[PDB]
Design a protein around this ligand. Structure first.
Ligand SMILES: O[C@@H]1[C@@H](O)[C@H](O[C@@H]2CO[C@@H](O[C@@H]3CO[C@@H](O)[C@H](O)[C@H]3O)[C@H](O)[C@H]2O)OC[C@H]1O
Length: 396
């Protein structure tokens, strides 16, 4: 049938997963004859299943979460993403003013944003007190010192989900964004040119952290979001003191604590500044989640994504996922002190870079994430990270 749409998302948390069921049901109630068939896919599996299914758009999801950045661009150029410019509602246009640019390519809108998720450090204030760290580090060297204190106090300072590749790389991305001048950064990302010494500088500053041996001991086999021993699991259960992640974090932790209630002592601080770095200071980096429509899909699919953008649905989103909703007026409903800081940092930001691997596309993103892991496991150098990106870049 044509009033029956297939919907793919990545909410693994029960609350998040529940929210979508509820939106589906209450959408069927305002849309007679229409049934939403849901697939919830674990995030680390999502790209593969999407990129396989959408080889044949006819037999693929009507509505799906976007991979973002260059990865969304790859799907557009494959004709796997419907143009929603003349199709989004006026409520979307108005309330997602800021966020919609993440979904805009060649002046065309390809999706509806549901959240904006900038990155930084999520930490156990308690484990911080127990190690003698009273203030959050404004500098990289200061941070490495706090790792020294935390290691001595007998806790793993930093949880690292290196088994998934990207969580490791996030350290590298942030170092680059603090080392590279905004112009070298922006140009490197667009031109796939990585010759500047700030790319190697960054890895060196990362090697230094590795040498301090302050990661959780199984970081190489630790996933990011799966199970109690995942890196978010370790943070949520106070087995590790901090993690570097996007603002989806509180809702993930909330799903992994012993009682599935928010983490009592969760705190946030921006990525520290780096001495001698040329990065625009306080430069934000993060993500925007949005949903795309199959080009082979019908009006019901369109009405579904517009339904996502409505303020009540977005306010619910914010509470279900413990995140910042895309819709500006829905953000009023955000009560979490950590998210409140992040919104502040967000509100006064000149810009926000998308995740680096997202910005660089599949080949380069993957090669990069993999090489950072290589050097953290002692089988690679800062130079090898650059080499890998350059090599993958030859494909386009
Ligand atoms: O390539 C990297 C990405 O894959 C990464 O994806 C984000 C990671 O985690 C996701 O958080 C989910 C939020 O809601 C819960 O219900 C889920 O269970 C989590 O999986 C997130 O939505 C993705 O956008 O971001 C950064 C890249 O480096």
């Amino acid at each position: 049938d044509d009033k029956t749409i297939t919907f793919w998302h990545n909410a693994s948390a029960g609350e998040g997963r529940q929210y979508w069921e509820n939106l589906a049901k209450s959408f069927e109630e305002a849309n007679p004859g229409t049934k939403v068939e849901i697939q919830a896919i674990q995030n680390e599996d999502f790209a593969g299943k999407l990129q396989t299914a959408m080889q044949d758009p006819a037999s693929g999801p009507d509505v799906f979460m976007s991979l973002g950045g260059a990865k969304t661009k790859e799907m557009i150029d494959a004709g796997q993403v419907m143009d929603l410019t003349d199709k989004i509602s006026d409520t979307v246009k108005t309330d997602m003013k800021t966020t919609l640019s993440a979904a805009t390519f060649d002046g065309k809108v390809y999706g509806v944003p549901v959240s904006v998720e900038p990155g930084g450090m999520w930490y156990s204030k308690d484990l911080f007190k127990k190690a003698g760290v009273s203030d959050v580090p404004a500098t990289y060297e200061e941070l490495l010192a706090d790792a020294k204190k935390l290691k001595d106090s007998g806790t793993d300072a930093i949880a690292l989900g290196a088994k998934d590749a990207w969580p490791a790389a996030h350290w590298y991305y942030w170092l680059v964004l603090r080392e590279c001048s905004p112009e070298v950064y922006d140009k490197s990302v667009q031109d796939h040119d990585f010759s500047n010494a700030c790319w190697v500088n960054a890895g060196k500053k990362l090697q230094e952290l590795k040498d301090l041996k302050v990661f959780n001991d199984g970081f190489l086999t630790t996933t990011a979001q799966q199970g109690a021993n995942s890196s978010a699991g370790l943070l949520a259960n106070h087995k590790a003191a901090m993690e570097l992640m996007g603002a989806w974090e509180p809702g993930v932790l909330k799903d992994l604590t012993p009682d599935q209630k928010p983490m009592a002592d969760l705190g946030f601080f921006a990525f520290p500044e780096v001495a001698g770095g040329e990065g625009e200071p306080g430069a934000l980096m993060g993500g925007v989640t949005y949903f795309c429509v199959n080009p082979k899909a019908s009006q019901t699919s369109i009405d579904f994504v517009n339904y996502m953008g409505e303020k009540k649905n977005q306010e619910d989103y914010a509470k279900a996922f413990s995140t910042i909703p895309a819709s500006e007026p829905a953000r009023a409903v955000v009560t979490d002190e950590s998210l409140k800081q992040v919104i502040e940092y967000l509100d006064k930001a000149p810009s926000m870079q998308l995740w680096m691997d997202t910005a660089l596309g599949t080949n380069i993103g993957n090669a990069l994430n993999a090489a950072v892991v290589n050097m953290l496991s002692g089988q690679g150098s800062p130079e090898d990270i650059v080499k890998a990106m350059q090599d993958a870049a030859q494909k386009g």
